[PDB]
Structures are given as structure tokens and as C-alpha cells.
Amino acid sequence: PHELESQFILRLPPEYASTVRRAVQSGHVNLKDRLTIELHPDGRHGIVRVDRVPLASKLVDLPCVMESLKTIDKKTFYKTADICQMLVSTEKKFIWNHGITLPLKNVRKRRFRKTAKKDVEKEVKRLLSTDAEAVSTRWEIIAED
Amino acid sequence: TASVTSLNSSATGRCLKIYRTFRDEEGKEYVRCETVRKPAVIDAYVRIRTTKDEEF
Predict the structure, then answer these.
(1) How many CB pairs under 8 A join A and B?
(2) CA geometry: angle at A36 spanning A31 and A39, to 5°?
(3) Cβ within 8 Å, pair B41-A124
(4) CB atoms within 10 A of CB A82
(5) Bridging pattern class, strands A77-89 and B16-21
(6) How far is CA A81 from each of CA A62, A65, A70, A94, A136, rounded to the nearest angstrom?
């Protein structure tokens, strides 16, 4: 079978980004030893090791949706993957408010309609399970107390 | 955060409290009263309960 490739964006500190960029544009397999990525079983935490120097990483959710588009003639572009995650290196914390491009900054707060937005279902399921487990259930919409 | 209108705990300004009777190991009959301070989720839960009553 075929499994859709999973592309994400890696953001590095600027000096380490310059060293990684120079090693990528060089093209040797020396970069392979220099750059490693360890993703922790949290799923939202990691180390990126540049030249064997550990950096602390967080996999965050991006507010917009990006799409990688490949081409052979630079006139027709074929969509290859959807990017929604970024492993910035240096829950609410795992959500990124800004977008990658310069015009998209504070997009989630300002350029996003709140009608579309709004975990709730999981809490409802837990409440239903507790009610099923219980013998007698008493409910009242309340006031200030 | 960009200034936005802050909604009250629902139109009624009413929270949801649920009592639950259970039997512990050996012999016991403890009752746990739990209050939902979340306005939306609480409204959805009340709607689900009324819907379930009609499912009879």
C-alpha cells in the first residue's frame, strides 16, 4: 500500500539555523551525523541535536494550513502533502498563534473568525460513563452558590 | 488577547450540579455531588439528557 508522507516544519535558533542551512546546501552525508531528531513519548516534546549540541523542542499546531506543491515545469503544481505542525527549537502551549509568513502574525487572535472555533466531547463521554456507573442521579440547573 | 465580548455562564447564568450514588467495595453507599462550572458543555449535557428522556 501507499502511506501519505508526513511533512512538518523545523524552526531552529538563528545561528544553528545558519549552520544547518550551510550543511544542507553543501550536500554531504556529514550533515546526517551532525543533525539528529529525538521525539519524546509525550508527542509534543523533543530534542534536536545540531552538531551534537542538544536543543529543546516543542511540536506545535499551526493556525493556518500549508500545502507543499511540487512542480516540474513551474507552471503546473501538484499538491504533495498538508503541513500543520512545527518543531520549534530553542494543550494551549502546543498551539502556535502566529503564521509562518510575515503578513500572518496574530492570525488566530485577529484574522480568524471566532464563529468557526468552538475536548468538550471527551468530558461529555466521561460524564455519561459516571452516570451509567451510578445507581441514582440528581440534577438541578443552579444559581449563585 | 484581542478584546471580545465575554459571554455570561449561559443566557440563564446557571451552572449544572450532578449528584451520583455508587456502592464501594465490601458494603458502602457514598454519594458524590459534582458541579459543572463550564457554561457551554453544561448546556449540551442538559440537551442530551432531555433527548435521552424522549428516546424512551
Answers:
(1) 59
(2) 160
(3) yes
(4) 13
(5) unpaired
(6) 15, 11, 10, 21, 51
